[PDB]
């Protein structure tokens with residue numbers, strides 16, 4: 001058997017900070033421009049469940065500006081739902097590209113967001129939900145609420161994928177993290193509230209944001225992320241949302257064996 | 273002399289329709305997937321003026337979702353201004369990526385838009401103009417009005433670039449086209465008003481949208497674009513905003529010698 005079966009499969013679609021690596025002006029920072037692993041798209045995760053016959057349920061976490069190229073390069077040509085962490089540009093400005101799937105599926109695309117995120121999507125992308133005055137474009141999205149500490153499930157051809165959302169502090173706003181089975185996704189986080197600890201401890205894989213070496217008001221530094229990894233004892237940790245000071249080979253050396261920097265297209269399967 | 277001097281230089285950053293080619297679901301339509309010229313980013317044009325010493329003024333027309341990769345691949349690492357045609361997703365959803373230049377230039381990025389476009393950018397990207405409640409992010413953009421039949425000039429290190437905007441019908445809304453010297457850029461157009469004809473006739477290069485073979489309410493078909501090219505007698509025409517029915521090699525054969533389909537990265541210099 002040479003295709004995925006009886007598993008969850010995770011693909012790190014993007015592992016960069018908000019301006020990407022390099023920045024738009026060609027700035028690679030301290031990254032080796034010759035290592036393709038240092039070319040970073042904006043942060044996003046693809047989550048799939050495969051059954052015994054290889055049928056799949058497919059869910060994306062965040063639709064940033066790189067969403068179209070991320071999906072094309074993933075090789076996965078269908079989508080059941082999108083789930084959002086928070087309403088920052090690098091996580092939402094690719095939303096229009098969900099249109100194609102609406103035509104393929106013959107129904108509105110199910111999207112999942114908390115109230116803060118939803119209310120900002122309605123402000124800035126209202127035409128995706130309701131046809132405005134002077135337009136003939138039908139809406140393309142169907143909104144579902146999510147909230148910390150309330151699990152939700154997304155159905156599809158591979159069976160249901162159950163998400164456990166939890167609260168994160170992200171500078172001056174809240175973002176969501178998610179546990180999916182044994183795998184935890186924590187991007188855009190500067191502190192973990194006490195009530196969220198149960199969701200983040202004892203993960204088989206912890207995917208955790210580490211922006212740079214120096215402190216930043218909205219994200220963990222590398223040292224802060226490593227302190228959390230030591231406390232939470234994941235079997236493996238993968239760093240994400242990495243900015244131009246963090247070079248792949250350098251960070252690989254500086255971190256424990258069970259910890260690695262992410263790279264775009266990083267893919268693994270786990271039991272379900 | 274092996275770098276540009278004493279010229280205008282134009283780069284077709286993107287030549288695709290709104291979902292790109294291929295679509296996000298991997299659909300190439302009738303395009304040969306093996307020809308790299310058929311991989312199309314969303315429509316945008318880079319305009320540069322170089323002086324005798326190779327100093328440049330750099331202006332982008334539209335900042336769609338592909339804007340960051342377009343600029344990186346262009347090799348041009350600075351920007352003086354952005355000019356907008358109309359407020360559709362494929363032309364504006366990359367706007368946040370102007371942030372990097374604001375830091376480099378030490379001043380807000382000058383953006384140019386008509387009232388319709390400006391009012392939609394304020395709705396959907398207000399935080400780029402004014403810090404909202406609960407935020408510490410400074411604004412990044414400085415807005416300037418443009419209107420059909422009123423020329424405007426953008427200053428920079430290579431000298432001024434003079435734009436002549438004009439009205440286009442684009443289905444149920446108006447879009448702007450621009451003449452820059454001898455070069456005319458007409459994307460997202462389904463009809464030309466009589467008063468715009470003076471700007472589009474007798475171009476050295478006419479860059480004109482041709483979506484597909486079949487009629488569409490918002491864009492010229494290939495046949496309609498060719499009818500206009502015959503009436504307007506440009507020396508050379510380049511087709512843009514091309515959707516998945518239009519294969520590069522096929523359209524090259526079907527069109528007169530002085531007419532060609534565009535491709536991403538297409539670049540030419542003209543006298544100033």
Ligand SMILES: Nc1ncnc2c1ncn2[C@@H]1O[C@H](COP(=O)(O)O)[C@@H](O)[C@H]1O
Nearest residue numbers: 018087088089090188218368371399409
């Ligand atoms: N009010 C806002 N709405 C959406 N995006 C914002 C807002 N304010 C700032 N941003 C952008 O959100 C991103 C913040 O990046 P991060 O450091 O990854 O939390 C940057 O792309 C900012 O330019």
Ligand SMILES: Nc1ncnc2c1ncn2[C@@H]1O[C@H](COP(=O)(O)O)[C@@H](O)[C@H]1O
Nearest residue numbers: 096099127137290359360361362460490
């Ligand atoms: N009210 C709106 N604001 C912004 N973009 C829109 C709106 N309505 C539709 N669109 C998108 O704008 C694009 C229209 O594409 P075009 O066929 O190139 O004119 C598509 O990406 C649409 O999903």
Ligand SMILES: [K+]
Nearest residue numbers: 252255256259
């Ligand atoms: K390591």
Ligand SMILES: [K+]
Nearest residue numbers: 524527528531
């Ligand atoms: K031809």
Ligand SMILES: [Mn+2]
Nearest residue numbers: 018088090188
């Ligand atoms: Mn972010």
Ligand SMILES: [Mn+2]
Nearest residue numbers: 086088170188
């Ligand atoms: Mn953020």
Ligand SMILES: [Mn+2]
Nearest residue numbers: 290360362460
């Ligand atoms: Mn368009």
Ligand SMILES: [Mn+2]
Nearest residue numbers: 358360442460
């Ligand atoms: Mn349009």
